[PDB]
Ligand binder design. Structure first.
Ligand SMILES: [Mg+2]
Lengths: 132, 121
């Protein structure tokens, strides 16, 4: 379907302090417009914008929710065919844990930027290992 | 749910400017396997022959080798209808061998995001 790198696969791994944790719901949101608006305002501070959009304060637009996926196999949450671009802009995605069994410690939110390397089609899969 | 895979064909010495064409051979492939009694390799070899003329409506994408002799085919469907997808990879413009790739159980299960093909000569 693609003659040029158009999409990437993102697998989030929920492990314990060597221990996979299956049945944990991760939700992926498109934060592309808000992300580049924040970076353009702050003067090119990418890390600062990743940290700001990773906060529990930030309430994404309800129409930004792309997919909701449960951890299976080796604590893997598979997000296939995430667009590299949202319009003319490199895509940026927020990954939140929105549901977990009881006694499963909560994971940190992750803001991922579809950087030059990914736009160029060098990686078919991104493997994320969230802390917390 | 795993719906597509990426296929990169490598034409190595890298040989850039070589046109690889990918065809959907799913229907003919499963018709051949059902006729021969489940011989997958035999059907891969039969559809890899220069004899086999694919249906004109089966051509998906035509891609030129660039960078490290790489021909990138992104978002190839794992299924064509209810069936596991099967693709024929030909050099259409020393010549390389044709490859018939089956979207097997492992690929249907989403264990590989990319298939890296190295055709012989
Ligand atoms: Mg894709």
């Amino acid at each position: 379907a693609a003659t040029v790198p158009t999409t990437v696969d993102v697998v989030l791994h929920k492990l314990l302090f060597d221990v996979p944790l299956n049945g944990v719901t991760f939700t992926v949101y498109d934060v592309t417009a808000d992300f580049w608006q924040l970076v353009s305002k702050n003067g090119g501070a990418i890390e600062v914008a990743q940290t700001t959009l990773s906060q529990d304060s930030y309430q994404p637009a309800s129409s930004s929710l792309i997919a909701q996926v449960v951890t299976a196999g080796q604590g893997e949450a598979y997000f296939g065919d995430l667009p590299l671009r949202q319009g003319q802009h490199a895509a940026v995605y927020l990954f939140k844990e929105t549901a977990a069994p009881k006694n499963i410690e909560a994971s940190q939110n992750l803001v991922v930027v579809m950087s030059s390397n990914l736009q160029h089609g060098n990686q078919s899969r991104i493997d994320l290992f969230p802390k917390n």
